[PDB]
Amino acid sequence: AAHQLSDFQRNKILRVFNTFYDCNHDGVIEWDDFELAIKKICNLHSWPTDGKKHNEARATLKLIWDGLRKYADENEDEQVTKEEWLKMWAECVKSVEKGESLPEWLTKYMNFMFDVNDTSGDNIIDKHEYSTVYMSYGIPKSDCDAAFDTLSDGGKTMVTREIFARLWTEYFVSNDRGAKGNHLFGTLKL
Ligand SMILES: [Ca+2]
Ligand SMILES: [Ca+2]
Numbered sequence: 001a002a003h004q005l006s007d008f009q010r011n012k013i014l015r016v017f018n019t020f021y022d023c024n025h026d027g028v029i030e031w032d033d034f035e036l037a038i039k040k041i042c043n044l045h046s047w048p049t050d051g052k053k054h055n056e057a058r059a060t061l062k063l064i065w066d067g068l069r070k071y072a073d074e075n076e077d078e079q080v081t082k083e084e085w086l087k088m089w090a091e092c093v094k095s096v097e098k099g100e101s102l103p104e105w106l107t108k109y110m111n112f113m114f115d116v117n118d119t120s121g122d123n124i125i126d127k128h129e130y131s132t133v134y135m136s137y138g139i140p141k142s143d144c145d146a147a148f149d150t151l152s153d154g155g156k157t158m159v160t161r162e163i164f165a166r167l168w169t170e171y172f173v174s175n176d177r178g179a180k181g182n183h184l185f186g187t188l189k190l
């Protein structure tokens with residue numbers, strides 16, 4: 001009585017491990033991966049290392065890693081493995097299906113990524129801002145452009161902070177292959 005992750009769900013959650021959290025592709029998340037993530041973003045947007053954007057990104061990522069460790073690092077080595085990661089997500093999905101909200105470190109990350117996408121600062125991610133960011137993570141442009149149209153409902157919805165936040169939740173927990181949120185980090189062929 002209860003339940004595991006479906007193949008669908010597990011693979012969506014491993015995809016994000018591999019592409020966005022494990023920046024040195026060694027199979028585990030560590031503070032070292034976050035430092036890398038920080039360099040990557042500074043390079044993308046041309047932020048100087050000792051600036052306030054950089055320093056605010058670092059501070060935010062520290063809180064996020066602190067919350068992630070608290071949630072997932074069961075053997076307390078300051079390293080989160082795919083094992084630790086999936087075990088945690090199993091409980092984060094269930095808790096979400098029962099009304100609870102996602103963990104605070106996760107919402108923090110979502111809001112931080114929204115901010116990273118929305119370089120114009122107008123509270124809207126546009127198609128160019130979007131592919132600029134996900135293409136930097138190895139997502140093909142054609143899967144960025146298709147995903148954007150899906151996410152914005154072919155332009156009927158503005159991808160604001162709140163819309164990004166809802167889509168974000170749906171990516172990680174939805175078991176519906178027709179959900180829009182499935183394509184938040186590039187088109188999934190389904
Ligand atoms: Ca790593
Ligand atoms: Ca660990």
Ligand SMILES: [Ca+2]
Pocket residue numbers: 117118119120121122123124125126129
């Ligand atoms: Ca914008």
